[PDB]
Design a protein around this ligand. Structure first.
Ligand SMILES: [K+]
Length: 131
């Protein structure tokens, strides 16, 4: 049937959302459109690219994108990764199917933190697929 769409959103579409897009494409498959966006665009975090390369997933061609209203309104599920009280978190429109998936921000930390968060996101998406 028709493709379903998942949208991972956060502050700068930099790390958590990029690793989620990378895992999402691999796990969910071609029957899903797997996108990611931010309220700002900070570029794809180098350590996030390296963390995904370690698990044989290439995210070097990903782009850091801004939130698109036509993808929010037409998505089957919008997943917020930006911590609700943290700083600069995106405002979501009403009736849009949403869930908050909380993972620690690996920004400015050692590569091990990117590995930890990468793996927490892996399991979250794997379990999501099996719902
Ligand atoms: K993106």
């Amino acid at each position: 049937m028709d493709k379903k769409t998942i949208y991972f959103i956060c502050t700068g579409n930099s790390a958590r959302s990029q690793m989620a897009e990378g895992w999402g494409k691999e796990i969910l498959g071609e029957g899903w459109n797997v996108y990611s966006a931010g309220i700002e665009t900070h570029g794809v975090n180098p350590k996030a690219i390296e963390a995904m390369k370690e698990v044989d997933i290439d995210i070097s061609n990903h782009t850091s994108d801004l939130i698109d209203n036509d993808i929010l309104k037409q998505s089957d599920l919008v997943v917020t990764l930006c911590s609700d009280a943290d700083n600069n978190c995106p405002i979501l429109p009403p009736n849009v199917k949403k869930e908050h998936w909380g993972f620690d921000d690996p920004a400015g930390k050692e590569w091990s933190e990117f590995q930890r968060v990468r793996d927490e996101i892996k399991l979250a998406i794997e379990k999501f697929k099996l719902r």
